[PDB]
């Protein structure tokens, strides 16, 4: 019962209110014995004690059932669950005021009320950063900020309840506890507030989209350059952006704190490719929003984690994700063509600084240059599947010896920094010069394949007239 | 629908009030008797009073003032309309013509405020510069008295004291200072306040508050020379020129408290006083060589319970008694057993208050007489009013007249009475002492016990003063046939009300029979508590009691058993049975229509007036139209609305006919003042004999537009709109009268001028001009 275990809890708590309205009646005549001119005084006293016994017994069973609903965890589950605990505080507040006339009974409601406010402080904090902090200028590299520019972040909670007319004002604080040596200070120089109207909360949700958040170039008060650029560089420094959530509902003053994921803030725009490599290396080995000392110690990640991590740079950016056939050549270009193991612990320094043979190009600079050239000319030949993508010369020269003659393929050149190249077999496999984006600017590769005839059947047998027919 | 013609046969004779002074001239004294709906000017002559003209007014006079302001030769009459409309009146003459004009005009009605049950106190300051009006408890309205002020406007001064007993002015002082007795839970006391028109507030007066008795009520103003304030409570008569205390406490005053007073001497040495019994008193102020030296009292004989006294010339005092007839009393030097230094100079007639009456034509053959039970106690007299035209035969009973019915087996008049006896030796010689036979009731199941005193029709002598037991008080009396016996039994609903109990729990309805001079008892039917007015339903005795309305069946074995059990009623104060419809008049449930069913045995609730109005008198005209009177002087005729849609609204009586009357109806009757389409008569307290004539549909439209076109032509003194006045004083709804024809206005056309007749008949062409002059004479020939 993923959707029924919440609706039945509404009438379950309301069933106790059906006996509370009748309990007040027995409590009213009990107080009527004040200054009576007396055998019925003791009769109502013992009757009220037995009538207040089943009220506290069944209420304890509903407490344990509400705790199991939170341990299961989508948004609609805590919607109706929060309204149950909200109206529950209305029947115990009037019962505590009515038990002050010597009812033993006043202490029985305090132990049950303490568990209500304790569970409310557990589910509210548990309830999240939907929209990750990303800049509008970033294309497919989120979690990257810049000094002087603005960014947005949404800490929307699953709860969809708000007060009648109370605007839940919340704030976003950046760089308040992450002032450790190696981290720079960045403070918003403009309003960091969010006026959450009740209307947009009871029907949409507690959306706290903090927008227009500027940044300043500042350092630590007492230690500037060197201290903040030592253990952690500008491109590799983590900054946790806190968010003080203030939720008020019938005197329930709570000041939550939903910490977002650590981001990297740079002081320039040319260092966007290097700063993005530090983010991918952080969200791969772990996924914790609180981290201070992560890049101080050199990490070692195997190839099992770099597989699906690199596929997000083409699936979201262009469209087609990295197939397992493309990931087979990235391991050989970093460790060796005759590699047999897969648990090779790759360090962080060997990801953007170690050159890749035989091209003598670093791994990060080679992949970044590939996605840049194909995003302006090869965008229509990647998504549909006209090319295979990253294919090394060791594996390309093996499959061509088992096919027929006259067929050609389109892969990526490894001797250059990227671009496009062609190869065919007539046994002998030919090769052409790698064409960069400068050649495709005056004329794309669509007319090059047609008007060239060695090119006939595109991998494997697709005629050059049917594959590139829609691009003419 | 419901169209009725309300016309009066006789003008109200009860003296509501009187004020004397030089109204017409500067040397001619004039007694302006301010009665109900009229103000009559009387020239003080050697023969007494000389009427010149009676100027009619809209309703009663709340405040009457006859004062001459600085720089005036004619008394400025001040009349306050009952709808709180103030207007300054001025006497005007142009050749011995009575034409009172109007100096100023302005309404003083307030939307909110608790009305003073004691009364609206209207007084004028000795300097004649402001108007002291006490409209509500704690709300004083003062109107600036200016020579060039035509719009009367009164500002609200929040009197600090919420409730006050009596407000007066300090005569003798050179400032606008007042002397008023306020009412507090800690005790009533007197205080002085200054009405300064420059600050529009009350200010500390000459002296501080004074500790008086906790019973002091009437406040008598001390004239200019003496100075100070005389306050008479239940007994003590205190004097307060300044912080001086001169209180005399005559034991005789303790019993009969002082109600009215009169200033004989302008100095203030001789101040005539009036108690609640009629005994004439007179204070003796001697100026100590101005401070008072001593204070004495004397007895000047007993009169009819008075209300307003005015001093005339040559030692003449007008006794404006409301209970009983008013007599001009001339102060003389004569002395007798009671030391009455007064004589009865003149005697005027009075008809109210009419407690009960009936139309009997035994020797009248039509044109039945009106046996009005006027007056009370010693003034209780059966004025035999008979049309010739109206001859009045006073029958003094010296006892309070209660209920009177018609007996056709002995040609007499059975009248209930409650004489007053000091706790029990008698005080006044009532008709019981002058009766022929006296006996007490058989069964047993200061003081005013009920006694049955049957009086003859021709001899006017009490044949049998059959009194009842101690603590036995009757409330109803039925002298009609009961069952198959044609003898008019005397079903008297008496009650054993003990002086120690607080709720009615014991009672005994006895039945008697008058047989040739003998009051012989039949049987008795003890009940629980006090019963109300009952009317025999087709002979069958229909009981009233209080909340339970029953129907006692008369058998042949001398036994009266109940047969109904109606509990919906709360009070049967005004129970009437007509045909099959049983109309019970409740105080709060108003009109309730019932219907007896022999197959069931209970009165079924069919119609009920939805308005919760306080009833005063009911009357059944037809089977669908029923006239009802309210305590706020308003008439209303409801129609049977039992043919609607929803079953809930079918039990609601639709009130369409609505009228603004003005008089308080106490009892209804059936008859006319002409021998051999309306014969509805009723007796009022003010003494107005009224006739309701059920007009037809063709005759209602003939006077509908005629009355509306006459309100803008014939106006009263003050340019007051007639239709505006014709509005109800009902708290629930203040509305103009709808569905009735005011006879008073129609009467004005008989004595109207000749050219004024064409101004109201030219806009009507009955299928006209001269026809409207002849058809109005038939409306006055029926009484």
């Amino acid at each position: 019962e993923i959707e029924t275990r919440i609706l039945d809890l509404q009438t379950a708590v309301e069933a106790l209110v059906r006996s509370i309205r009748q309990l007040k009646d027995v409590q009213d005549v009990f107080s009527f014995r004040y200054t009576v001119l007396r055998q019925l005084v003791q009769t109502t006293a013992n009757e009220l004690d037995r009538m207040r016994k089943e009220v506290l017994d069944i209420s304890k069973a509903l407490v344990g059932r509400l705790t199991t609903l939170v341990d299961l965890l989508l948004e609609q589950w805590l919607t109706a669950g929060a309204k149950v605990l909200f109206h529950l505080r209305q029947l115990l507040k009037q019962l505590k005021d009515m038990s002050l006339m010597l009812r033993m009974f006043g202490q029985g409601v305090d132990l049950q009320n303490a568990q209500v406010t304790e569970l409310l402080q557990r589910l509210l904090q548990r309830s999240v950063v939907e929209t990750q902090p990303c800049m509008p200028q970033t294309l497919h590299r989120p979690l990257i900020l810049k000094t002087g520019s603005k960014f947005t972040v949404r800490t929307r909670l699953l709860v969809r309840l708000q007060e009648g007319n109370e605007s839940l004002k919340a704030e976003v604080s950046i760089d308040r506890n992450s002032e450790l040596p190696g981290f720079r200070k960045f403070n918003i120089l403009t309003s960091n507030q969010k006026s959450l109207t009740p209307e947009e909360g009871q029907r949409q949700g507690l959306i706290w989209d903090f927008g227009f958040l500027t940044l300043v170039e500042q350092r630590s008060v007492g230690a500037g350059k060197g201290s903040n650029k030592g253990p952690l560089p500008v491109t590799e420094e983590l900054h946790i952006i806190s968010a003080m959530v203030e939720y008020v509902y019938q005197g329930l003053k709570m000041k939550l704190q939903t910490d977002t994921l650590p981001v990297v803030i740079i002081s320039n725009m040319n260092q966007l490719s290097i700063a993005w490599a530090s983010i991918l290396w952080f969200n791969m080995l772990s996924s914790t929003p609180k981290d201070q000392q992560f890049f101080c110690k050199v990490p070692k990640a195997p190839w099992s984690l770099l597989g699906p991590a690199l596929s997000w740079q083409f699936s979201s950016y262009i469209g087609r994700g990295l197939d397992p056939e493309q990931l087979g050549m990235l391991r050989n270009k970093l460790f060796g063509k005759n590699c047999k193991t897969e648990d090779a612990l790759l360090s962080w320094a060997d990801f953007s600084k170690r050159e890749s043979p035989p091209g003598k190009i670093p791994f990060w600079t080679w992949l970044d240059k590939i996605l840049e050239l194909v995003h302006d000319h090869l965008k229509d030949l990647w998504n549909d599947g006209r090319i295979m993508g990253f294919v090394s010369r060791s594996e390309e020269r093996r499959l061509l010896k088992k096919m027929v003659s006259g067929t050609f393929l389109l892969r990526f050149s490894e001797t250059s920094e990227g671009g496009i190249t062609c190869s065919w077999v007539e046994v002998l496999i030919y090769s052409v010069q790698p064409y960069t984006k400068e050649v495709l600017q005056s004329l794309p590769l669509t007319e090059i394949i047609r008007h060239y005839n060695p090119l006939r059947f595109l991998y494997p047998r697709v005629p050059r007239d049917e594959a590139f027919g829609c691009y003419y | 629908m419901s169209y009725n013609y309300v016309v009066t046969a006789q003008k109200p004779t009860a003296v509501n009030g009187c004020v004397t002074g030089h109204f017409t001239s500067a040397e001619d004294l004039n007694l302006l008797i301010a009665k109900n709906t009229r103000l009559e000017i009387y020239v003080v002559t050697a023969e007494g009073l000389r009427p010149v003209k009676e100027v009619g007014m809209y309703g009663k006079i709340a405040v009457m003032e006859l004062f001459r302001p600085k720089g005036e030769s004619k008394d400025l009459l001040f009349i306050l309309t009952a709808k709180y409309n103030a207007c300054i009146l001025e006497y005007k003459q142009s050749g011995e013509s009575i034409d009172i004009i109007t100096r100023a005009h302005g309404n003083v009605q307030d939307r909110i405020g608790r009305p003073s049950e004691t009364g609206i106190i209207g007084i004028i300051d000795p300097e004649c510069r402001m108007i002291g009006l006490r409209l509500y408890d704690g709300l004083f309205k003062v109107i600036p008295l200016d020579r060039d002020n035509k719009e009367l406007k009164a500002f609200n001064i929040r009197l600090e004291e919420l409730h006050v007993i009596d407000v007066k002015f300090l005569y003798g002082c050179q400032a606008p200072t007042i002397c008023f007795v306020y009412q507090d839970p800690q005790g009533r006391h007197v205080k002085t306040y200054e009405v300064s028109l420059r600050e529009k507030e009350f200010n500390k007066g000459p002296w501080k508050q004074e500790n008086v008795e906790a019973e002091a009520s009437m406040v008598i103003a001390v004239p200019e020379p003496f100075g100070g304030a005389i306050i008479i409570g239940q007994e003590s008569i205190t004097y307060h020129n300044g912080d001086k205390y001169l209180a005399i406490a005559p034991p005789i005053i303790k019993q009969s408290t002082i109600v009215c007073h009169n200033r004989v001497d302008p100095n203030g040495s001789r101040y005539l006083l009036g108690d609640m019994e009629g005994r004439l008193f007179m204070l003796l102020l001697e100026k100590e060589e101005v401070t008072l030296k001593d204070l004495r009292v004397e007895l000047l004989g007993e009169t009819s319970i008075a209300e307003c006294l005015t001093y005339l010339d040559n030692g003449v005092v007008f006794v404006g008694s409301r209970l009983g007839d008013s007599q001009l009393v001339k102060l003389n030097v004569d002395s007798n057993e009671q030391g009455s230094y007064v004589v009865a100079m003149e005697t005027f007639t009075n008809l109210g208050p009419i407690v009960d009456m009936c139309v009997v034509d035994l020797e009248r053959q039509g044109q039945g007489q009106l046996v009005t039970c006027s007056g009370a106690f010693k003034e209780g007299s059966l004025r035999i009013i008979r049309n010739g035209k109206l001859h009045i035969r006073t029958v003094p009973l010296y006892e309070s007249p209660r209920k009177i019915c018609y007996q056709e087996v002995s040609q007499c008049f059975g009248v209930l009475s409650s004489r007053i006896e000091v706790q029990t030796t008698a005080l006044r010689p009532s008709a019981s002492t002058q009766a022929l036979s006296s006996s007490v009731s058989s069964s047993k199941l200061e003081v005013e016990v009920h006694n049955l005193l049957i009086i003859d029709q021709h001899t006017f002598e009490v044949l049998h003063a059959h009194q009842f037991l101690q603590n036995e008080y009757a409330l109803s009396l039925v002298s009609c046939k009961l069952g198959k016996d044609p003898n008019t039994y005397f079903i008297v609903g008496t009650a054993m009300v003990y002086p120690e109990e607080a709720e009615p729990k014991q009672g005994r309805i006895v039945v008697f029979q008058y047989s040739d001079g003998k009051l012989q008892t039949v049987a008795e039917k003890e009940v629980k508590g006090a019963v109300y007015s009952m009317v025999e339903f087709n002979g069958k005795l229909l009981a009233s009691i209080n909340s339970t309305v029953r129907l006692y069946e008369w058998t042949t074995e001398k036994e009266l058993r109940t047969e109904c059990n109606h509990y919906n009623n709360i009070m049967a104060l005004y129970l009437k049975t007509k045909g099959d419809f049983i109309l019970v008049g409740d105080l709060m449930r108003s009109v309730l229509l019932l219907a007896y069913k022999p197959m069931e045995g209970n009165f079924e609730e069919i119609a009920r007036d939805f308005n919760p109005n306080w009833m005063s008198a009911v009357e059944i005209l037809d089977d669908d139209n029923f006239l009802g009177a309210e305590n706020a002087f308003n008439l209303f005729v409801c129609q049977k609305d039992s043919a609607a849609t929803t079953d809930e609204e079918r039990q609601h009586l639709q009130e369409v006919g609505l009228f603004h009357l003005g008089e308080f109806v106490n009892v209804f009757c059936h008859g006319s003042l002409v021998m051999q389409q309306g014969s509805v008569l009723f007796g009022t307290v003010n003494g107005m004999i009224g006739l309701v004539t059920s007009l037809s549909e063709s005759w209602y439209n003939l006077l509908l537009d005629m009355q509306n076109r006459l309100n803008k032509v014939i106006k009263s003194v003050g340019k007051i709109e007639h239709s505006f006045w014709r509005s109800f004083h009902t708290e629930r709804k203040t509305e103009p009268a709808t569905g009735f024809i005011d006879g008073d206005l129609i009467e004005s056309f008989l004595d109207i001028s000749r050219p004024k007749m064409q101004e109201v008949v030219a806009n009507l062409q009955y299928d006209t001009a001269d026809d409207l002059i002849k058809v109005v004479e038939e409306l006055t020939r029926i009484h």
């Binding site: 009748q22 009646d25 027995v26 005549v29 107080s31 009527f32 004040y34 200054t35 009576v36 001119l37 019925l40 109502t44 009757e47 005021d97 009515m98 002050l100 006339m101 007060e163 009648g164 109370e166 403070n187 120089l189 403009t190 500027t214 300043v216 008060v221 008020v248 019938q250 005197g251 | 909110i112 405020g113 608790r114 049950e117 509500y136 408890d137 704690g138 709300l139 609200n156 929040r158 919420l162 409730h163 019973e215 609640m276 208050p353 607080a502 709720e503 709360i570 009070m571 104060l573 449930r589 939805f610 919760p612 305590n631 809930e648 609204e649 609601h652 308080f664 106490n666 307290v685 629930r732």
Partner: protein
């Protein structure tokens, strides 16, 4: 001696208007020479100080430090004379203060607040700083601003129109308890007589259905008077009610002659109806006609009408110490009556509560009806005399850039209906003030700059403040740090224009009790939120930076 140096943060960017106020009222410190007048003798022994940082400023003279942010200057405009809806002004600053006390109220009796009678006595006491003809137009706004926080303030803390809505919901729950008498065994034909008192049968006796409007007319109370007395003669017979039974029995007999009842009965007691009380707060209302309730002790009746005349029984219902009132009874105390059981007496007790709650429902309704007319009397009289003063200012300005804007807006305030309906007329009245171009001598720009000077402890315009402004002025610095009451203009009240109508006050907004659970609670300690610091600062304590130090303009002129 005991100086104070502020510190302004660079947050909230830079506005062109804020730069003129700071340059003309604040001085930014840089090095040590510009701050040597306050005793800033820094010894260069501190490590952080020597590291090029301005930290560890050594001070010979102790002072006070304020962490001021620019955000607080943007909020200052909502804390000045012209704040939420205040008038633009020497005494106008103190006017805004006392006006916030009327709005920010936890549970104080709404009757204690100044009503129309005393408000006028203060209207002529307002003072202004530089024309004389323009002072009447500025003062003509506070006469209607008092009704914005009460009359026009629907669903807000301690308000008269919003208090009616709570009485309707409480009257419905009260009738549900009296119909549960028979249902609940603990609480023959006795269970059917109580059902007649319910409004389901009372409204049927007149001809109107049972809705949420029949319990507000004056004719409805006349029908319930007959059903109350019917429970006192059948269900009860105690010696207390028995005395009043003989009074109504002899009253109908004294009416046969047309006379009243003199002082004859000596064993009579002070009944509840003959209680002469009046609301001291209300200028003029008249003696209240108290109902003829019984079953009350003579010592408990005097204390009931004491609070009625003063606080109309509000504290025992909504306010402080409300738990002790439920032990005895908010509408009527738990009295004892003989010849009745604990269930018999309980029935007639709930019927007497509805007889008093319905009577009190018409009292609070009528008191505001009279007040809506009392406020309309001074409003209609003010617009008749304020339009004449501004008319003479136009003729004098013509005979002698803001001349044509006066005659075009002087006739726009004459087309208002001023009656309901009347709620939309007040929204367009404040719009004419913004269209009137004030001269440079008296604008809002200067008023805001002057506000900050009064907030500091080195400058003060007025020392004495009214009692209402005594607690009200504590809310001015509150808004500067965090503005609780934001700009409440005409536009916002237009959308929720709940006119003073029986079919609008009860209906309309129904789910407004959620914010009231935290509204009153918040106002309890809202008068103690003032950002101020007075701790002494030593050489190595409270170390900040010299460049961030800010001082007022009046501080440099005093040295």
């Amino acid at each position: 001696a005991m100086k104070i140096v502020f510190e302004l943060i660079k947050d909230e960017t830079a506005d062109p208007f804020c730069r003129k106020f700071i340059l003309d009222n604040l001085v930014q410190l840089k090095d040590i020479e510009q701050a040597a007048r306050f005793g800033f003798a820094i010894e260069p022994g501190s490590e952080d100080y020597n590291r090029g940082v301005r930290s560890f400023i050594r001070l010979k003279e102790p002072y006070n430090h304020v962490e001021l942010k620019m955000s607080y200057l943007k909020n200052a405009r909502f804390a000045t004379a012209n704040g939420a809806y205040g008038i633009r002004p020497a005494w106008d600053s103190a006017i805004w203060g006392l006006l916030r006390e009327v709005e920010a109220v936890p549970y104080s009796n709404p009757f204690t607040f100044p009503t129309c009678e005393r408000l006028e006595g203060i209207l002529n006491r307002l003072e202004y700083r530089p024309t004389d003809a323009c002072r009447t137009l500025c003062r003509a706004t506070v006469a209607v601003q008092y009704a914005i926080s009460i009359l026009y303030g629907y669903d807000r803390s301690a308000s008269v129109p919003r208090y009616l809505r709570r009485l309707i919901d409480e009257y419905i729950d009260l009738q549900d308890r009296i119909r549960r008498l028979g249902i609940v065994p603990v609480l023959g034909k006795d269970m059917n007589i109580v059902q007649n008192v319910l409004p389901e049968r009372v409204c049927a006796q007149i001809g109107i259905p049972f809705t949420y409007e029949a319990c507000l007319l004056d004719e409805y109370y006349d029908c319930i008077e007959s059903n109350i007395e019917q429970m006192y003669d059948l269900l009860c017979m105690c010696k207390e009610c028995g005395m009043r039974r003989m009074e109504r029995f002899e009253r109908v007999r004294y009416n046969t002659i047309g006379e009243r009842y003199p002082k004859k009965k000596r064993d009579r007691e002070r009944f509840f109806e003959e209680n002469y009380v009046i609301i001291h707060s209300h200028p003029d209302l008249g003696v209240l006609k108290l109902p003829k309730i019984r079953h009350l002790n003579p010592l408990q009746q005097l204390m009931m009408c004491r609070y009625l005349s003063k606080d109309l029984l509000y504290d025992t219902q909504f306010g402080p110490s409300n738990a002790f009132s439920r032990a005895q009874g908010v509408p009527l105390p738990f009295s004892a009556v003989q010849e009745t059981d604990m269930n018999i007496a309980y029935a007639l007790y709930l019927a007497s509560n509805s007889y008093f709650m319905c009577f009190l429902l018409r009292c609070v309704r009528d008191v505001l009806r009279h007040e809506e007319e009392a406020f309309r009397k001074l409003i209609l009289r003010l617009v008749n005399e304020a339009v004449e003063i501004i008319r003479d200012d136009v003729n004098s300005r013509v005979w002698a850039s803001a001349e044509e804007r006066d005659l075009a807006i002087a006739r726009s305030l004459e087309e208002l209906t001023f009656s309901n309906g009347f709620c939309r007329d007040a929204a367009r009245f404040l719009d004419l003030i913004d269209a009137f171009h004030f001269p440079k001598a008296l604008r809002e720009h200067r008023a805001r700059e002057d506000l900050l000077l009064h907030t500091f402890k080195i400058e003060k315009m007025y020392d004495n403040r009214p009692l209402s402004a005594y607690y009200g002025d504590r809310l001015v610095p509150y808004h500067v740090l965090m503005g609780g009451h934001r700009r409440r203009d005409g536009a916002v009240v237009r959308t929720g224009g709940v006119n003073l109508t029986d079919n609008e006050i009860v209906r309309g907004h129904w789910r407004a009790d959620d914010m009231m659970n935290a509204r009153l609670r918040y106002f309890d300690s809202i008068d103690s939120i003032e950002m101020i610091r007075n701790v002494s600062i030593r050489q190595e304590t409270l170390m900040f930076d010299l460049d961030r130090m800010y001082i007022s303009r009046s501080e440099l002129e005093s040295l």
